[PDB]
């Protein structure tokens, strides 16, 4: 399956499928570009860059960059050094980056390829679920400052998508749960009768086939650019991918690595959803299609939470990578819903401003 | 003096005359920014940063971030240093950069401005009469890598620019030379018939008071304006700002900091208006002409071709088919010649090589 993205009139066509890799040869003009720097963080299986590099080595040579992952060497300086490289191996302006990993790779690979000669042609090979269903579908590149997560970039679109579900579905199961959150956000926060699954097709073990990843991806597409083909900056209308972020990142950052950023999200929806509910805004059944989604896909069932409140506050309150969260003394801008489907609009915006009372309450009352 | 430019549909005011941020709570808001971040290269003159810091500390706070200067430590790195100091201070999304120095400020704190939170205010103060006339029309910015000048950057605009032409009337004359260079550049490629100066206004001390500086800015504003508010990535109809810029490079690395910018891209003028007429484009007279002007402003006075023709070709061979490069070139003055639809004609690099041999 291929389907034609545009941000604005930015467009890149993203393949998703059972071997699309083999069949890079359909979608790349033949002398589009002169050379391939594949680019992968240290965490991406070998098996995977060997055989990303091998097909496009079919279309001009390649050479493989790795670097270290995590997000302590998310950083401009990995960047440069990876661009140093680059140059060294002849990289010009009909090279292309390819980057082949999960969000963390996308990112630093789309900071090197937005930056060299002012812009280069970035691919992307996404080979975590989050990566194809969510994080490909968003032109914002960024890496990290000591002081903070993802603090400099800009937005910057690919000119490929390349999304491999054989790969994804092989992909670790609480990995395939983490995207599979994001979806399931989704589902509750955009209005859809456009994806051909049901609540049925999830199950709890978070182990899909190529053909069902396929299905969740094309769902995917069609929720986010429906919103972000005309807020390309996620400024505006495209908030909404942010349900369940405002606590999530923060909950996130308290638990150092210990839960997923699917796992964190799921957790501060159930607390946008409680939130929305105390001040009147969302029936309690919606609240229930919350838990009931998010049971589907197993997302509250592991979860080692080990975090007190207040470090989760902490976090909350110094964090910056989101303007206006809070707003002033008492109060903290959220996305919250009147209603699975129905964004709850304040002031011709999506944040709606929370009690500090009411995100400490759910907050130290956890699941 | 104040023009609106616009590049596409990110528009700001330029603001220049003299003492023009004694005036700056005309052009910005009270309510617009919480927080004035200078950022200055070292080789600017303290007495500037500090006149700066004065006037934009009547608007919110503004803290001065200093940086070592000069081409070697234009990187990505120094950006970063500079990002994280920022933030230290409370830098945040209502905080606006202030570049005060030249060009090298200028592209510093425009990656480092256009990063920031995926993009802050970006606010020219240009303290060189290149960076006032040339390098604050153009929305790139860029720094170096190792392997060479300018590879990593981007374009970003600012919100706005103000250029003092009391300060650029007391800048160095080498320096106000480099910028009327381009100048004369703009004068070459684009016809004109309406300008508010003849070449009897230029001199070769490269001496000027503050209003004939403001009449070259003006002239340059409309100069680069009239091509680059459409263009503007410098794709296109743009290509003609990088006349003299194909060879101008290369002799600019070759001299090793030896020749300005505007000196080298003089140069590269020359070599380019003498291989446009060693194709037949160009008729010898129009040659003569790009002396003729290029010596007005003392243009070819304080350079050193202290080099050999071959390492200048080496570098120009090395800088980003097999017997050609593409160049600017020109018919005549003011007529840029297209090649299959391009302003990019390919000329042999054996055809290059032999005018560098030649020498002015
Ligand atoms: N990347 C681009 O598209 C682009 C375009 C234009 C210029 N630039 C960059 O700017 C540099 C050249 O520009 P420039 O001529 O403005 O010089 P510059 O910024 O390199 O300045 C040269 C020297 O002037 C000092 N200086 C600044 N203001 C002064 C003043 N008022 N009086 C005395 N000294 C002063 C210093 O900062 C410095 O040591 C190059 O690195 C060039 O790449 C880049
Ligand atoms: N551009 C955007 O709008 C955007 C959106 C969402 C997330 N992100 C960024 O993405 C990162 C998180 O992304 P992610 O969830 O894809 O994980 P990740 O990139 O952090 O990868 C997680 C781990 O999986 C490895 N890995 C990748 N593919 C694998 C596979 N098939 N099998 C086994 N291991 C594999 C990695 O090397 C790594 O150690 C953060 O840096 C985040 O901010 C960016
Ligand atoms: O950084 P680049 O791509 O080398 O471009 C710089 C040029 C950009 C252009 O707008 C200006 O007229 C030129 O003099 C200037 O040198
Ligand atoms: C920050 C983002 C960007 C947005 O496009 C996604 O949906 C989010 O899940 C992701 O965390
Ligand atoms: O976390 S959200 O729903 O603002
Ligand atoms: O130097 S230019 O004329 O390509
Ligand atoms: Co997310
Ligand atoms: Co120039």
Redesign the interface.
Same mark, same amino acid.
Request: hydrophobic residues 40%; charged residues 15%; glycine residues 16%.
């Given at each position: 399956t291929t389907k034609q993205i545009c941000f604005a009139d930015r467009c890149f066509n993203f393949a998703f499928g059972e071997h699309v890799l083999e069949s890079v040869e359909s979608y790349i003009p033949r002398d589009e570009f002169d050379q391939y720097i594949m680019i992968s963080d240290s965490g991406v299986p070998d098996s995977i860059v060997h055989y990303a590099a091998e097909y496009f080595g079919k279309l001009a040579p390649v050479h493989i960059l790795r670097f270290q992952g995590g997000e302590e060497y998310k =950083? /401009?300086?990995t960047? =440069?050094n990876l661009?140093?490289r680059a140059? *060294?191996l002849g990289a010009?302006?009909r090279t292309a980056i390819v980057a082949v990993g999960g969000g963390l790779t996308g990112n630093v690979a789309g900071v090197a390829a %937005?930056?060299? +000669?002012? %812009?280069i042609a970035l691919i992307h090979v996404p080979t975590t679920f989050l990566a194809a269903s969510d994080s490909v579908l968003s032109i914002?590149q *960024?890496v990290n /400052? =000591?002081?903070?997560k993802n603090?400099? %970039? +800009?937005?910057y679109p690919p000119r490929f998508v390349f999304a491999d579900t054989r790969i994804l579905s092989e992909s670790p199961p609480r990995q395939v749960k983490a995207g599979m959150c994001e979806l399931v956000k989704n589902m509750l926060i955009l209005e859809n009768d456009n994806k051909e699954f049901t609540e049925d097709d999830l199950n709890s073990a978070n182990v899909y086939s190529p053909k069902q990843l396929e299905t969740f991806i094309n769902f995917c597409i069609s929720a986010k650019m429906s919103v972000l083909s005309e807020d390309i900056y996620e400024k505006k209308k495209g908030l909404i991918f942010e349900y369940g972020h405002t606590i999530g990142h923060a909950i996130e950052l308290a638990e150092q690595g210990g839960i997923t950023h699917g796992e964190a999200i799921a957790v501060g929806m159930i607390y946008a959803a409680k939130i929305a509910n105390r001040m009147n805004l969302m029936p309690e059944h919606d609240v229930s299609a919350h838990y009931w989604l998010l049971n589907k896909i197993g997302a509250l069932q592991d979860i080692p939470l080990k975090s007190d409140p207040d470090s989760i506050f902490h976090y909350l309150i110094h964090d910056?990578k989101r %303007?206006y969260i809070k707003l002033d003394e008492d109060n903290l801008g959220m996305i919250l819903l009147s209603g699975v489907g129905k964004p709850a609009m304040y002031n011709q915006t999506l944040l709606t401003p929370v009690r500090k009372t009411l995100i400490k309450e759910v907050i130290r009352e956890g699941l």
């Open positions: =950083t /401009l300086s960047v =440069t661009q140093e140059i *060294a010009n302006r %937005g930056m060299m +000669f002012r %812009g914002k *960024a /400052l =000591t002081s903070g603090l400099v %970039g +800009f937005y910056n %303007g």
